[model samples]
Target: VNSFSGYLKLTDNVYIKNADIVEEAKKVKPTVVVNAANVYLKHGGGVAGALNKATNNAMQVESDDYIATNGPLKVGGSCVLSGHNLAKHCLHVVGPNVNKGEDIQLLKSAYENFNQHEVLLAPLLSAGIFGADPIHSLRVCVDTVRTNVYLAVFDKNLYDKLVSSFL
Candidate 1:
């Protein structure tokens, strides 16, 4: 199936609003999972607040199930970071630019967990970074990833299915 659409509506529930990645990840059952790029929790409101928030989020994810499962994790398709890339021991696949297909491949590879790893953490599409907007970049990332599987969104702007987002 190339494409399909459905309408999902749920009954009234005690829903939390605007919970960042850390809060959202907390609600899920501890298991294998993968997250998109935007690891930085900063809304760019200010350097200090954004930095603090991002640092906390990163710490939580790092401590929790989020694992860097993508290999050859290239910054711009090359030039690897010391502890960031090979530290997690994921198969790094280097190839064409990270436009869309590459990102999807990364997600699929992570979900497959070729190494029998638990969780996968990699950015499908980066937004608001270096002047990219969250919505647009998320659109590309979410849409591409959704085509292959499901996505879950804590942020109103982001959307995905839980089944596909995790193993």
Candidate 2:
């Protein structure tokens, strides 16, 4: 089940896969699945929404408890939580909100914040509603990561564009 789509590509430690984040998490079973989260680690929409659903909102509860003890995470900051039924753990990262005038450094920091692990499955943090370009986000991932970084994509058009650009 870890078989990726034929459209997958790799370069500079980044694995671009034409698949949903949750599916990639299930198949690849990375040490910790990355979630494009908020400062609060709220699993409300997009990737967070899907992961929250997959784990029956357990991640959300974990976030609540974590924040209760640790306080809200900052942009470019992150925390780990139980992944429940999906992957073993989840890395909840507070990526920059370009719409809110945050810089790319925060996005880069989000990837850099990853702890020691071999395989990592992540989405283009802030590439969707937060207004960062997905392609540039991939570049950020490529530049910062040295280990396996899976860019699990959910949109077919984006996947097509990403694969075409790599070729």
Candidate 3:
């Protein structure tokens, strides 16, 4: 895995790591794992689907009650799930609907929605099924958080692109 570590001007705790999210979770033991989900709480695609499968869909079940009461979450809105299979808490963020040509600004807003948790494991928001440019999404993730942030990336090509952009 290709792991990139450095400090951006905004903060010193941000990290960009190219590793399987599940493996990273095993190693980091993050307090919170951010899941990029749809407003409807459907855990059927992208990082959300993988997370659901990893946790035996406990994340889906946990999110069901909230969505039932609150309706679809707004873009960039978030909800938390506890007792997940990997992390103790899962921070579910409603990512941009790229098919609708949603702006990357909405993705930045979503990344900023996380609370001040001590350790957070976040996927590249909107970079998967949403078809967002990975480098742009990575910038938002890096810029938004003040606490220690672990950016999990599975695709090697994408990781290379991110590293090149940093260079």
Best by lDDT: 2
Off by over 4 Å in 1: 1-17, 30-72, 76-124, 128-130, 147-167
Better of 1 and 2 by TM-score: 2
Query: What TM-score, over all chains together, does every model reach?
Result: 0.31, 0.90, 0.86
Per-residue lDDT tens digits for candidate 1, residues 129-161, read 223333443344333332232223344444443
Clashing pairs in 3: none
What C-alpha lDDT does candidate 2 achieve relative to the native structure?
A: 0.79
lDDT of 3 at 92: 85
Error (Å) of candidate 2 at residue 126 is 1.4
Q: Write the per-residue lDDT of candidate 2 for residues 34-133, one digit (tens) a residue.
A: 8889988778888999899888888888889998999899899888787777777888888898888988778878878764557777888888887898
Clash number by candidate, in order: 9, 0, 0
Error of 1 at 103 (Å): 13
lDDT of 3 by residue, 1-167 (tens): 22323313224766776788876765556778888888899899788888888878777887788788888888888887773668778888887978767766798788877645766878888887888888778777777767777777888888777877863
Q: Candidates' lDDT values, in order?
A: 0.30, 0.79, 0.76
Off by over 4 Å in 3: 1-11
